[PDB]
Design a protein around this ligand. Sequence first.
Ligand SMILES: [Co+2]
Ligand SMILES: [Co+2]
Ligand SMILES: [Co+2]
Ligand SMILES: [Co+2]
Ligand SMILES: [Co+2]
Ligand SMILES: [Co+2]
Ligand SMILES: [Co+2]
Ligand SMILES: [Co+2]
Ligand SMILES: [Co+2]
Ligand SMILES: [Co+2]
Ligand SMILES: [Co+2]
Ligand SMILES: [Co+2]
Lengths: 271, 271, 271, 274, 274, 271
Amino acid sequence: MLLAHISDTHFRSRGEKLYGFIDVNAANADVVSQLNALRERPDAVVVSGDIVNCGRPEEYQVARQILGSLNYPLYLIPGNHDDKALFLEYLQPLCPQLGSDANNMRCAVDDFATRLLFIDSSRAGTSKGWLTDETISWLEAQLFEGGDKPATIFMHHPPLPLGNAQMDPIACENGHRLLALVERFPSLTRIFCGHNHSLTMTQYRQALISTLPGTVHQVPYCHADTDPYYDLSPASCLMHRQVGEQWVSYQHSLAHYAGPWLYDENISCPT
Amino acid sequence: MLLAHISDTHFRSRGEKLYGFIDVNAANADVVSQLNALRERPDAVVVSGDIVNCGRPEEYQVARQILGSLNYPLYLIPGNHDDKALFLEYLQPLCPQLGSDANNMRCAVDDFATRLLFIDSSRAGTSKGWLTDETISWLEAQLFEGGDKPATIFMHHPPLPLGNAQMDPIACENGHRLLALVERFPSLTRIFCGHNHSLTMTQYRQALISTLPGTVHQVPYCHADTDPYYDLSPASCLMHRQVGEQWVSYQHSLAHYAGPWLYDENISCPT
Amino acid sequence: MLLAHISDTHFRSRGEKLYGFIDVNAANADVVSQLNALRERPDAVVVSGDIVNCGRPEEYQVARQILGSLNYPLYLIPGNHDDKALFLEYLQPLCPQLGSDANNMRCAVDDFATRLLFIDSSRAGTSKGWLTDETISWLEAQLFEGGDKPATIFMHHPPLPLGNAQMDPIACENGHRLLALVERFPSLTRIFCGHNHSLTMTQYRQALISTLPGTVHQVPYCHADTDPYYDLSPASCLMHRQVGEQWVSYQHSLAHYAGPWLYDENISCPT
Amino acid sequence: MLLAHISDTHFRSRGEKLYGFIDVNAANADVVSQLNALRERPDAVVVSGDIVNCGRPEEYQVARQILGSLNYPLYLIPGNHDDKALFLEYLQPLCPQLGSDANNMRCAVDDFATRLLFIDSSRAGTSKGWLTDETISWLEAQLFEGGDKPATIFMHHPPLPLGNAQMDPIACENGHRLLALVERFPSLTRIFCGHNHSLTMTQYRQALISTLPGTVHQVPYCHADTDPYYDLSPASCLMHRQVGEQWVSYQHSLAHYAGPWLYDENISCPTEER
Amino acid sequence: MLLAHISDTHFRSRGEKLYGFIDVNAANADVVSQLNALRERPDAVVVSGDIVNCGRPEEYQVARQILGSLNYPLYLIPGNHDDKALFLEYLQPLCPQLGSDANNMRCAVDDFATRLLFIDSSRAGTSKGWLTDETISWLEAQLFEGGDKPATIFMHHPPLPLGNAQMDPIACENGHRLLALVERFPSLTRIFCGHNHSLTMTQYRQALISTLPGTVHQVPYCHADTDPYYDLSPASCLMHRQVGEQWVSYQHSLAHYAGPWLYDENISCPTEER
Amino acid sequence: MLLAHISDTHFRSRGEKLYGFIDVNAANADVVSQLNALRERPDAVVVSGDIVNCGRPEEYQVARQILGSLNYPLYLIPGNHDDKALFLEYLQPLCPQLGSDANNMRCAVDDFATRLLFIDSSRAGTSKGWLTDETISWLEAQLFEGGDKPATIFMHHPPLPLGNAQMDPIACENGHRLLALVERFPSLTRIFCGHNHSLTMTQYRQALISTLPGTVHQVPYCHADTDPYYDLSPASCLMHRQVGEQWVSYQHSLAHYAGPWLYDENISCPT
Ligand SMILES: [Co+2]
Ligand SMILES: [Co+2]
Ligand SMILES: [Co+2]
Ligand SMILES: [Co+2]
Ligand SMILES: [Co+2]
Ligand SMILES: [Co+2]
Ligand SMILES: [Co+2]
Ligand SMILES: [Co+2]
Ligand SMILES: [Co+2]
Ligand SMILES: [Co+2]
Ligand SMILES: [Co+2]
Ligand SMILES: [Co+2]
């Protein structure tokens, strides 16, 4: 298993820029072509929510064009910036397991050594996350049924506070429900999130829990300052690899940079 | 607790550049001034190994000058590129807990809600890591006496393979001795490493285990390809914060980038 | 009093770029977000003319939306690139004190220790500036009424030759009439202008007279060469502050640059 | 008269970078080559103090090499980071008009329509400026003898506070003495200063008073915050030109940027577009 | 004679970017203004094919506007990404000497010491080049009538393989027909081509044969790897100059870069340094 | 045959920069590592003169270390900036085929399908090129020796004027002697030169004649202007490849740039 995992694309409508000046559409199209050009090719691409910025049909038309040009199987989940019904309308042909109920989108993938669980933590009319009873029951059923096989969950909102003054108030509101699932099921070992536009990682019992950077604009972590900052610090994605019994995640830069070159001992330490 | 954690500085001697072209001395002096300018100031700065590139006295002269200009308490550990005896000579006044035995450098910090354990996984004559009997014994004693107080270990070499073709052959060779300690001591929940010049994270039982990017040059993760690449993809460090019961780590960019600006809902979704 | 003073925005219609390649609309949206994000917030933003590039209705639609997203009271005046009627129609709601006569747009502001006088020096069918009889009488009356209260005038066109080969022929054609006002009224101590896309400054009796850089492209100063050049040298604005009895202007960069860091005596001069 | 005017070069010793990471020596060598390559060549180059960073003889060796490669007559004055004796020992050959007394370095230039007065406002032991009695007396003598001929003063420290929280406490401490000269002598119409690493301008009676950007690093203007910031925002110099009866100053970017191109009416307002 | 020669502009529809992220329309607008701003002004500009990306009418609307804004006579030829009928409809008014037959667009220019020959090697339904009987027969007639006077051919597709694994399979399929004319006619001493988005040159008998860089995106030369790579490595055009008896071609960067400065002996080899 | 061909490296002594601000030493060390990292490995690397800037011993020290770290056989020739005796002393161990006479450095290589002839056109006391009686006699002998086997000459100075106002006066002054050999010997079909810091190409009879870009700073071609300009427009090398009967040269960028990506029909022309 190799997954390429990106988040928070924030597509805008045709010929608009984010905030009038960040060309998210072009930036994301570069990202798509970079993923398409990888020498070690992913088995699939994950996009963990906030696919569009404003929930508009015209933004989804751009998302479908750019995401649909990815040359991989896609696993897509909504964020709070998404509109559930439009997300299904425009993206279900790119991820057929999202199904037909805008309010119960979720799916499991059993192709690999670890089970993958994709859920919707977004809730209409708020930035905060919410896990419904049906999502929780479905999770319990999948973890129960999976038995001994490890599982990873992908969701938009972090299920616990991370100390980030901007982002904490809008985390997953009843995230304790999912934390109760990591207590009950030892096989649940990864929870990966979007929303925070930052690589922020913590550990609860046996599960590693981590947010991801955005594909374009980032949000700095502040512990006290609640001013709503964003910036254009370097974007990246996370690569997830099955390595024996270990699930290993590593950061892959989406910036254009100098190199690579080859290490040579004579060049490293000249005489 | 707020820690700024940087790694793999690879200082060169005065007026020399890494590989003849990467100005590590200047990039590191920038980094130092960046850390000195932080608005939310860390309590301490960790540097997790490969302080110098060639283990030369004249490189430690530079390292002492630049690291010596950080306005913070420092916790310094060696890597495989370091010379243990010069490390003590030139850096012990900056981290006095390193003591006077070049072959037994380690120390524990009890100032915070989580215990900090700093060790030397480096071995002379090899790039591979090695945990000595003295080190493993000291670790067991710390963890036994710590009781239910959480513990974090900082070491140069990762204690398990991560699937990185370049890096796995030179991980910590007897790292299973540390994995045995994670098994035995549930309070051991974080292990942070240098060496890989990449943010690569995994989980073993209750312990989150992660390598850090370098402060200057980076090493791409490859699964198959053994060619020894390095590049100038974006540099960063890790900030570690105690957030109630959770240790939270987040990535802090050391690049110069555009912004911050302030999110405004009108600008975000114009009419 | 703190004023942020920008000039010569040259907005184009939606999705268009200046000369087909300079993204003025994006650059200006970035500027507006910079101004909104200032820690020391100005009391008002001045925009001294050439708001649009071609005087077209769709350019004004973009200007109204982008300038309308500034979180400040605005003072707007036209330049030669503007169209007076459309300027009034689209922009007057953002600056109502201009009145409702497109041919006599001007205003006095008395909120601060120094009186602010905003006038229209643009003339239909020409790049040249022109001061109407009405504007001059209004100016004389304002300056009589004001007595020993200091006054600053903002206008598009500079009142006198500056030796700039490209710009001098298209300065204020009857600028002598404003210079006459400077001789007669010791209270008139500042004249700030757009048009030249350059920080150019001179003194006539008690008055400091300065043109401003543009927000995007700049015009180099050449003494002999009349080739009509432009460039993308760095953009800035002037901040104007009342410091006791002094009106102080300082340049504020609108470029994205490395820093800031903190000065440290021992880093500056190491031993 | 055309003058190129740069300030606060802050040269470091050979093979040293400012703060360990800003290559001030390389940046200044680029600036010198930029000034040498100008199509419209200045009559002289002014450098208004803080020529070196630490007052060290090794920094003066570098300053002398780099400023000595300028293909122009130089007018140099010190700043607080300069050491008076070393400044004269190393730089007097580049600007012999300053004399041979390190405590009284100044000169007047009468070649042009406006008289140019260069003074040392620096004072040993402090960052603050200070006008000595001999400087003040020399100034009064020049201004008296100049009569109706306009005059421009170049000095390191600004002679009045400008609202800059970091820089104001270290302005010219007896600046009021020079402001009294502005009142007395109507032909004194320009005072140009370094020190602030910022283009900050104001007017006091008939005199325009402006500080300059540095050639490398800059200092942001902050009204309340005393935190000693600096940054690498774009560097520039000031060009000063006599245009008829007007002294005109314009900013000349020292950054490397795209262009120039030529304006074309058809390209500006295309018949195809909204 | 001075010609500025650009190639492979790949214009897109108004508001569209190439592959969604390369702003070819803006990049080409910058290039046009760069050409308009040249101090040493060319006598004409050559554009050697792949004018639009997808052969669509909306792309030709953009090409016509931007190429239309060049302040020079234009010599335009198609590439495989062009549609011949639309190319003629939209661009013939910019290069009327092509004629009125979309299937037989070529022209010869006799203004200079060397004859210029512009031909269309593109063929509908394929990326490969193809020299038609009409084209070869007209080339022969031009070369034969030309007698002594040297000749230069401008065509989209290279007429021989160049060892480029990506590009060779889509060269001029019957390029041998043009190599046969090189053999027959010692007058024919240059053939310049687009298609490859690379400066690649070779020599066949008396003729120098060269492909050009693109104005925006480039294509790396690979000898074995057939992965279809492209990149944003530096763009440039070729300038062609008659220099007495020699035709001289030189690379002109279209990138925005630092400089120029002026060389100085004192600065090149300082007396202070090793 | 694959040759990587660079030129005009202009090395300075350790710690020095060209003109005080162009870091030739780092730029060239970057180039050397780029060449070492090439996927399609050249058979050899040619460096066609002006190896050092000032002809000083400490410059040759830097050149020897940096060029010595190329993992390829080298063919090195001097330019006018080089000193013949010091060139031999420091660089002849890197290219022993040159011989042991400083005033007669040259060699012929028969390894490939095209013979390679390396000559010294530099002359003490001048920037102009000169072919000595010995050099010209040797070339004649070698062209007799090659018979119908093709030949390529590498030299520093171009043997004919190219209309470049700065460079023509200091071309190879008796270059006509080489043009005479082209006429006599039809297998001589390439002449490659340094000196001009420009890709400028022409054809004389059967011989293609081309100057190369430098590795760092470039010289613009001007027809009339003799002002001695240099700039930092993009650097490159030429790769020379034997392709059946054709010698093919192609430009290889030494800049760091975005990409590569993979072309995709549906991304190129969306529907
Ligand atoms: Co988001
Ligand atoms: Co969100
Ligand atoms: Co390391
Ligand atoms: Co290591
Ligand atoms: Co304007
Ligand atoms: Co105007
Ligand atoms: Co200073
Ligand atoms: Co100072
Ligand atoms: Co093409
Ligand atoms: Co083509
Ligand atoms: Co050279
Ligand atoms: Co040369």
